[PDB]
C-alpha cells in the first residue's frame, strides 16, 4: 500500500521539524527560571525587611527565628534550633570555589576618575582550616580592563581574604601591593551563588568608592 | 533451473568475491592503522633522544632518509625551509582552548602542596598571523589539596606558549615562587606528555607529572 | 537469447577474481607484521638505555607512572605502587622460577678460567615461596659449563638463592662446601621471561668471572 | 526539505551497526578455536593407542604411508623412507637436544627410594653431533630430584647418552664413577618437542625406578 | 541527487538480508563447538588410557602426576602438588544442581524384559556438609516412560544418593521403595557437565542391567 | 558540503559497515568450514575404533548423544530405522564409475608383483532399486611391474560391492589365487582409504596399500 | 528478470571502484614496512649499545655471543659457534653489487667551503678473490653536483676500495687522482642494504670532513 | 555513445553463437580423419599386394625392401638396412597394453550353431622378457554375450598368448579351460592400433570357425 505508507511519512517528517523547533524552546525555557527568579525576589525583599539580627549575626529559619554569631555561622556544631546554621545550602563551598571567575562593570563614584570599566575577580586558591570551618580563606586575582592614555591597559593585583557564610560576604584585600589598590567586597545576596553585589573600598573606613555587580562566567 | 537458478548463481558469486575483496581491504587497513603508526613513531622518538643530537642546539631536524638541519625559528612559519617539508607539514596545536589534561604525580620535590594529581585547563589560545612558529596560551592550573588543619583548592592562572619547533609548551610561573611547568610532547602522541615543574631562572627539574588528555 | 547478458557478467567477475588474486599475491611478497614478542624486546633494550631514577634496592612500577618502590615490596600482597603495578600478574609471574626452568648461552670468560667460550647452563632445581614472605621465591638450581670441548667434560656446581621480582634478577650462589665454585646473576630485564643477561660471578664479591647472554629452554 | 530522507538513512545504518554488535558480542561469548598444539597432542595420544607394526629398533616414517625403517637410518642424510619423511626437518628437529634444554615433571617413585613424589629435572648440559654419523646426537645432561621437601636437599647426578630420532627418545645414564645413581628415559612421542614421558631407571637394567610425565622449560 | 542516494539503498537492503542470514550461521556455529568436541575426545581417550591411579583415587594435573584418595577429592585443603584437587572446574556443584534434569534412552540387556524406553533422572535436592565437602549428597526422582499392557505407563521412584567429584560419579539408590527398583549410576565422563553415561544396577553386585546415556535438558 | 558532502558520508559509512559485516560472516564460515568438520570427525573415528565395540557384531551404531543399535542390513535401505536417522542421512557412494584410486604400497607379503603402486579404476557401478544397502561395482586393478628378465603390465578385472553399512568396499578376487582387496573408508574422508589385500577364504591380511583418489 | 539482474550490476560496478581504490592502499602499504622499520631501530640501538667486541671484530648471534676477527668475518669457514659469521644475510654481495648507485646530500663541516650539495657514489666494478672471500674489492665513481662560480658544475673522480662484511663498511679511495679528493666512507648500519651513513675523510687521519647519508636509487 | 556501443554487442553476441556452433564442427572434424583413412587404404591394399616376403618374415621400408625373420621382428638390434625393424611405431607396446578392451560382433560360419553375438577380448596382463623383446606375452579375458535357452548368458574364459610385432598378430589360447573354447586370433591390419580383424579357430588346424572384427573401446 504505497500511498498510506509513503504518505505516513509526510506525517513523520513533520515531527522532525517539530521535535527540532522544540529543542529551541527547551533552550528558551532554561533562561527563564522561576524557582530562581522567585528566590531573587525573596532575597531582594529580605534585604529591605532586613534580618532581625544585629550586625555580625546569623538569622535562622523563618519558623524558629533566632540569632547566632557568625563565629558559628557554619562551624560544624548545631547552634540554631532548626540547625539552619549548618544547612548544607548555606555553606556551599562552591560559591567561591577556586577557579571561579566573576566579571562585571565597575561604575566609579568615589575615589578615582575612572571611566565605567570592567573588573574581573577570579579566585586563585581557597583553604578551609579543619579546626575552624566558619570561614573560607582565599587568594584571588583582581583585574581591571580600563582605557587610559591611548589604548586598552590592564590594572591588576593579587588579593587575599575570606568568605563568610553567614553574610555570604567575600572580602578581598590587596597582598600588600604597595601600588594602593582598593579592596573589593562582594555580597552574594541575590538568591544564588552565581551573582554578587560588590564595592571597591578603603580597607580602613570601608567607604564605598565604586559599585560593581559581578556574575560568574560560564565554562562552555 | 534456467532463468531462475542461473540468475541466483551470478549473484551468490558476486558476493562470494565482494567478501574476499573487503577481506583484503581489511588486512591492508591493518598495516596502515594510524594508531600503529604513531605508536611506533613514538618509539622512534625515545631512541632519537638517546642518540647524539642530530642537529645543533638551536636547529630542527627534518628527518627522512636524507637529513637537513634548519633553524627552529623556521618550523611552522609558512615558508618551505626543509627539502622534505617536515618543517611545515606537522603544525597541529595539541593543547588548544577547551582541552583539559590530568597529571599524575610521581616525583615531587618542590610544589607547595605535593599533590597527588594536578589538572591543567586551557582557557584560550591564539596564534599571531605573522609568526606561526609559536602559539600563545592562557592556562589555569587547578589543584585539590587536603590536610589536617584545613582543606584547600587552587586554580592559579598563567600565560604560556607552545613551540611547534619542538612540541614543547612552556607555562610561565603562576605564583611568584619561581616555579613553572614545562611539558614536552612525544611528537606523535598528544594525549600524554611528561610535565616537569622547574625553576624558570635555573631550569632545574624538581617535579615530574605524567599528563593525560582528559577525554 | 537469454544468457547473452549473463555469459559475460560471470566473466566480468571471473575478471575481478584475477585482478584481486594478482593483488593478494603481490601482498604475500611483502614482509609480515612483527611478533609482539619482538617489539617488546625493543621497548626493553631501549628502556634500558634511558635514564632511571630508582636508587639501588628499588625498581620502578610497571605502570604508566615510573614510580620507584623498594624491592622488598613487590608481590607481597599489598598494593604498594600508586597503581598497583607491583602486584599485577604480569609482574609477579613465576614463569621464571618454575621448577626445571633452564637458561643457557655462550659463556665467554674474562677473569677466572683458561676456558675459551663454552656453553653455560643455569637451570632451576627446586623452589618454594614461604607463605608469609612472598617478596622472595627462594630456590635452588645448578650451573653447568663445558670444560673440554673435545672429551666433553663439564662442571656442575649446585646453587642456592632467590629471585627478586623487583630487579627481575635471579641471584644464585654455591651451596657452601663443594669445591667452592661460582655463582651467577641473571637479569631478565630483556623484556620477556625467556631471555636474560647472565654473568658467572665469584660468590664472595659478586665479581664477574665470565658473561653469557642467555635464552630459555 | 533535503535531509528528510538522509536523517533516517543514517539511522537505518546506525541500526545495522547495533544488530551486528549484538552479534559480534554473542560471538565472543563462545569458545574460541583450539590451538593447533592441542589437536597435535590428541592425534599423538591417540596414535599411541593404535596398533603399530614397527618391530623393536624400528620407527615409522612421519609420512602419509606408515612405512617402518630402522632407527639407525633416521636423519643420516640419505632418503631412506619411501617419501623421505625420515629426513624432513619436522623429524630431525634438534629442538629437543638443544644445549640447556630442560624437562621436568613430578617424579613418583615406585621402586628404588623412600622418597614421596618429588620434582624431577632432566636438563641437557652439552651435545655434539659427529659430522659423519648424524643418526645420533651424542649428549650430556644432569638429572636432579628433590630429597627433603623441607630443607630442600637435592640429588644431582651427571649423565651421558644420546637422542634417538627414530624412537624420538632421550636415553641418558650416569657418567660411571659418582655414587652410581640413576639413568633416565624420556619419550617425546607426545606430539611436540616440549612434552615427554620420562622414567628414572636403573642404568644397569633400564628397570623403572620411578616415573614422571614431563614438560619443558 | 536522487539516483546515487536512492540506489545506495538497494545496496543497504542487501546488508539487511545478509545480516539476517548471518544470524542463522551464528546459530549453526553454536552447535559445532570445537573446544568442547576436543574435550570429548580427551576424556574419551583418557578413558582408554585410564588414570594411572588405583580405584578410588584422583589423578592430578598431567604435569605433576600423583594419586589422591577421593576422601580429599575436593575437600577444601590443597592435597595435590598442583592443587588440581581443588581446582574449581573439578568441583562445579552445578553438575548436579538441584533442578537439573537428565533424560535419555535406557536399553535393557540384563534384568528386565523391557522395550527400549526412556528414563528421566531429575535432581530433587542437594545438601553439602560444610564440614565434609568431598561429597554432594542428593535426592532425585527417577521416571521411566515405558509401554506395557496396552498404553503408555510411567514407572517412577524417589531416590537418594551422592555425587563424587573425583570420579564425577552420581549414584542414586531407591528410597527404600519396596517395589524393587534398580539403582541408577551415572558418570559424567564426556568432557562436560551436560552429558553422562549411566547404568541401572543391583545395589549389591553393581552388576549392570542396562545402558543409559543421558543429556541435560535445555531450559528454553 | 551540503547536497554533496552529506551524501558521500551516508555512503562511505554504508561500506564501512558492509565490511564489518562480511568480516564476521568470514569468522563464522571459519567455524563451519566443512573441511574442518570431516577432518575432525575423521579423528573421532580413529578413536571409535579403539573403544570397545559400541554395538554387536552385525549392527550399525547411530551415534549422537543418544545411541541406538540397528541391523547393518538397514543402513541406507530407504526406511528410517534409527531415531536420529544416521542409518539414512549419509548414503553417498565414494567409489563411483569413472573414479580412479592410486595405492601406495607399504607392506606387501603376497601380491605376485610386490609392486610399488597399484591403480584401482572403477568401470561401472549400479544399485538395485529395492536393496539400497549395497552398491555393486566392476573394477579393473591395474599394475605396472618391471624386472630384469622382463617388464609386465596388468589390468585384472573384478566384481565387488560397497556397503554403506560400514563404508567398506570388498573387491572379489581377480585372479584364481584367492587374493582379494578390502578397503574400509574413514567414514568422513572418501579421498583416501586403507586397502588390505587378503585371502578371501581366511580373511588374512597380507598387503596394505594407502589408496588416494586420483583427482 | 531484467531488474534483479540489471541491478546486480550496480552492485558489481561498486567492487570495480573498490578493487581499484584497494590498489592504491596496497601501494601505501608497501611504503610503511614494519619488519623493516623494526630492523632500523634494532640496528639504531645496537649502535648505541655497541657490539661487545673490540674494534675490528665481529659479534656473533645474540645467543652464543663471541668475538671473531674480521679476517674471517665472512671467509667460508665456520668460525663462530652459531656460524653467524657465514650466515648468508651477513654476506649479501648485493649490498655493493656493481651497478648499484647511491645518492644523497653531503653537508660539509670540515675541510671545504662547500654549499650543501649532493654526492653520487656508483659502484663501477667488484672482484672477490676466490681464495680470500672476507672482502669485496671494488672500483666506483664518485660525482658531486655542486654549484660554483656561476652555474651547475660536476666534480667527479674514480675510486678504488673494498667492502667489509663484518662492519658493512665501504671504503672508497681516489685512484691516485692527483686533484686531491676526499676519500668517502660508508657504513650500511640501518638494518638494510639500501641505506648507508657516509663521511668524506682524509685517507691519513680518517678525520671527518663531511656527513653524507646515501640511499640506493630505484631502478624503475 | 550508447548506440554504436550498445549495438556493437549484437555484433559480439553473434560471435558467441558462431564460436559455439564452431565447437560442434571441430567435433565432426575429429570423426573424419584423413591421415588415418589413407592409412586404412594403404594397409587395405598392401594386404592385396601382399608383402613380398615369405610367411613368418618382416618386410622393410618401401625403399630398401628386404626380408627379416620375425625372431628379430623387433628385438632391439638393427637388422634391416633402413632399421624399419626397430622403428618405434612398429613396436608400439600400446596395441596390446594391459587393460585394453576389444569388442565386436562374432559371426559364426564354422564350428558352432551360434546366433550373431558379440565377443569382448580384454587384455589381462602382459610381460615382455628383457632378453627377448621380439614378443609380448600376455593373458586376457574373452567373454561372449550370447543368447541361449531363455535369456542373456555369458560364455567367458581366460586365455594366454602372445603378440607379434612383425605381423601385428595377437594369438589367444584358452588357459587349458577344459570346456573346449575356440582360440581367438586377431591381426591389427587396418592402419592403426585401434581396430583388428579376428577369427575363432581350432588351435590345431587354425581352421577358421568365425569372423570377428573388433574395435578398441573408448575410455570416456
Ligand atoms: Ca554552628
Ligand atoms: Ca619552514
Ligand atoms: Ca606490594
Ligand atoms: Ca680467555
Ligand atoms: Ca635416512
Ligand atoms: Ca613410595
Ligand atoms: Ca583435597
Ligand atoms: Ca534404515
Ligand atoms: Ca669465518
Ligand atoms: Ca631386429
Ligand atoms: Zn584595579
Ligand atoms: Zn524404573
Ligand atoms: Zn668530489
Ligand atoms: Zn566363448
TrEMBL record, chains A, E, G, H:
Where are the bilayer-spanning segments?
none
Listed binding positions for Ca(2+) are: 72, 75, 77, 79, 85-86
**Which residue ranges does the record assign to the Annelid erythrocruorin linker subunit C-terminal domain?**
96-215
Q: Which organism is it from?
A: Lumbricus terrestris (Common earthworm)
Keyword set for this entry?
Calcium, Disulfide bond, Metal-binding, Signal
**Which residues form each disulfide bond in the chain?**
53-67, 60-80, 74-91, 111-209, 186-198
Record's keyword annotation contains Calcium = yes
Gene Ontology MF annotations: metal ion binding
Q: Highest taxon of the source? A: Eukaryota
The name of this protein is Extracellular hemoglobin linker L2 subunit
TrEMBL record, chains B, F:
All disulfide bonds of the chain are 55-69, 62-82, 76-91, 110-206
Q: Which InterPro entries match?
A: Eryth_link_C, Eryth_link_C_sf, Extrac_hemoglob_link_heterodim, LDL_receptor-like_sf, LDLR_class-A_CS, LDrepeatLR_classA_rpt
Pfam families reported for this sequence: Eryth_link_C, Ldl_recept_a
In which domain of life is the source organism classified? Eukaryota
All copies of domain Annelid erythrocruorin linker subunit C-terminal, residue ranges: 94-214
What does the UniProt keyword field contain? Calcium, Disulfide bond, Metal-binding, Signal
The residues forming a coiled coil are none
Under the GO molecular function aspect, what terms does this record hold? metal ion binding
Does the keyword field hold Acyltransferase?
no
* UniProt-annotated binding residues for Ca(2+): 74, 77, 79, 81, 87-88
User: Could you identify this protein by its name?
Assistant: Extracellular hemoglobin linker L3 subunit
Automatic annotation (TrEMBL), chains C, D:
Could you tell me the keywords of this UniProt record?
A: Calcium, Coiled coil, Disulfide bond, Metal-binding, Signal
Q: Which Pfam families match?
A: Eryth_link_C, Ldl_recept_a
Q: Where does Ca(2+) bind?
A: 73, 76, 78, 80, 86-87
Provide the disulphide bond pattern: 54-68, 61-81, 75-92, 112-209, 186-198
State whether keyword Disulfide bond applies: yes
Q: Which residues form a coiled coil?
A: 13-52
- Family annotation (PROSITE patterns): LDLRA_1, LDLRA_2
GO molecular function, a single term: metal ion binding
Annelid erythrocruorin linker subunit C-terminal domain: which residues?
Answer: 97-216
Q: Does the keyword Glycoprotein apply?
A: no
Superkingdom of the source? Eukaryota
Spell out the InterPro entries in the cross-references: Eryth_link_C, Eryth_link_C_sf, Extrac_hemoglob_link_heterodim, LDL_receptor-like_sf, LDLR_class-A_CS, LDrepeatLR_classA_rpt
Query: What protein name applies here?
Result: Hemoglobin linker chain L1
Amino acid at each position: 500500500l504505497d500511498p498510506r505508507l509513503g504518505a505516513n511519512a509526510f506525517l513523520i517528517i513533520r515531527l522532525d521539524r517539530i521535535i527540532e523547533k522544540l529543542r529551541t524552546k527547551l533552550d528558551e525555557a532554561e533562561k527563564i527560571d522561576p524557582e530562581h527568579f522567585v528566590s531573587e525576589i525573596d532575597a531582594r525583599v529580605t534585604k529591605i525587611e532586613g534580618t532581625h539580627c544585629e550586625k555580625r549575626t546569623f538569622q535562622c529559619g523563618g519558623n524558629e527565628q533566632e540569632c547566632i554569631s557568625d563565629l558559628l555561622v557554619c562551624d560544624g556544631h548545631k547552634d540554631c534550633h532548626n540547625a539552619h546554621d549548618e544547612d548544607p545550602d548555606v555553606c556551599d563551598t562552591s560559591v567561591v570555589k577556586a577557579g571561579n571567575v566573576f566579571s562585571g562593570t565597575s561604575t566609579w563614584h568615589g575615589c578615582l576618575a575612572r571611566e565605567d570599566h570592567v573588573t574581573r575577580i577570579t579566585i586563585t586558591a581557597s583553604k578551609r582550616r579543619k579546626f575552624f570551618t566558619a570561614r573560607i580563606w582565599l587568594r584571588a586575582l583582581v583585574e581591571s580592563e580600563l582605557e587610559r592614555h591611548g589604548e586598552n591597559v590592564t590594572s591588576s593585583f593579587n588579593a587575599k581574604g575570606y568568605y563568610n557564610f553567614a553574610s555570604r560576604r567575600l572580602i578581598l584585600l590587596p597582598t600588600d601591593d604597595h601600588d594602593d589598590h582598593l579592596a573589593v567586597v562582594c555580597s552574594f545576596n541575590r538568591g544564588d551563588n552565581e551573582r554578587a553585589e560588590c564595592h571597591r573600598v578603603t580597607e580602613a573606613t570601608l567607604h564605598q568608592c565604586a559599585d560593581l555587580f559581578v556574575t560568574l562566567e560560564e565554562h562552555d | 533451473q534456467s532463468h531462475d537458478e542461473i540468475i541466483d548463481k551470478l549473484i551468490e558469486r558476486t558476493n562470494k568475491i565482494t567478501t574476499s575483496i573487503s577481506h583484503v581491504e581489511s588486512l591492508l587497513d591493518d598495516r596502515l592503522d594510524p594508531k600503529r603508526i604513531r605508536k611506533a613513531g613514538s618509539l622512534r622518538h625515545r631512541v632519537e633522544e638517546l642518540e647524539d643530537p642530530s642537529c645543533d642546539e638551536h636547529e630542527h631536524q627534518c628527518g627522512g632518509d636524507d637529513p637537513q638541519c634548519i633553524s627552529k625559528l623556521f618550523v611552522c612559519d609558512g615558508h618551505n625551509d626543509c627539502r622534505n617539508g617536515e618543517d611545515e607539514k606537522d603544525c597541529t596545536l595539541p593543547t588548544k582552548a577547551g582541552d583539559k589534561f590530568i597529571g599524575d604525580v610521581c616525583f615531587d620535590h618542590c610544589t607547595k602542596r605535593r599533590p597527588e594529581h594536578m589538572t591543567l585547563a586551557f582557557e584560550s589560545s591564539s596564534i599571531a598571523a605573522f609568526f606561526t612558529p609559536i602559539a600563545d596560551l592562557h592556562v589555569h592550573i587547578e589543584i585539590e589539596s587536603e590536610t589536617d588543619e584545613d582543606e584547600s583548592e587552587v586554580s592559579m592562572p598563567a600565560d604560556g606558549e607552545y613551540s611547534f619547533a619542538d612540541h614543547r609548551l612552556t607555562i610561565h610561573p603562576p605564583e611568584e615562587d619561581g616555579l613553572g611547568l614545562v611539558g614536552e610532547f612525544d611528537g606523535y602522541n598528544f594525549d600524554r606528555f611528561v610535565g616537569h615543574i622547574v625553576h624558570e631562572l635555573s631550569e632545574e627539574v624538581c617535579a615530574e607529572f605524567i599528563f593525560h588528555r582528559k577525554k | 537469447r537469454f544468457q547473452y547478458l549473463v555469459k559475460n557478467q560471470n566473466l566480468h567477475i571471473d575478471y575481478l577474481a584475477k585482478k584481486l588474486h594478482d593483488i593478494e599475491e603481490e601482498y604475500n611478497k611483502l614482509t609480515h607484521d612483527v611478533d609482539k614478542k619482538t617489539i617488546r624486546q625493543l621497548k626493553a633494550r631501549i628502556s634500558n638505555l634511558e635514564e632511571h631514577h630508582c636508587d639501588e634496592h628499588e625498581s620502578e612500577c610497571r605502570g604508566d607512572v615510573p614510580e620507584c618502590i623498594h624491592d622488598l615490596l613487590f608481590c607481597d600482597g599489598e598494593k604498594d605502587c600508586r597503581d598497583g603495578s607491583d602486584e599485577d600478574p604480569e609482574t609477579c609471574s613465576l614463569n621464571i622460577t618454575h621448577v626445571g626452568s633452564s637458561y643457557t648461552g655462550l659463556a665467554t670468560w674474562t677473569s677466572c678460567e683458561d676456558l675459551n667460550p663454552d656453553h653455560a647452563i643455569v637451570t632451576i632445581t627446586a623452589a618454594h615461596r614461604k607463605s608469609f614472605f612472598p617478596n622472595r621465591v627462594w630456590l635452588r638450581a645448578t650451573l653447568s659449563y663445558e670444560l673440554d670441548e673435545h672429551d666433553h667434560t663439564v662442571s656442575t656446581t649446585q646453587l642456592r638463592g632467590f629471585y627478586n621480582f623487583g630487579k627481575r634478577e635471579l641471584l644464585l650462589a654455591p651451596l657452601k662446601g663443594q669445591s667452592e665454585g661460582y655463582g651467577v646473576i641473571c637479569d631478565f630485564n630483556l623484556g620477556d621471561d625467556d631471555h636474560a643477561d647472565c654473568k658467572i660471578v665469584v660468590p664472595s664479591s659478586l665479581f664477574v668471572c665470565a658473561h653469557f647472554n642467555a635464552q630459555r629452554y
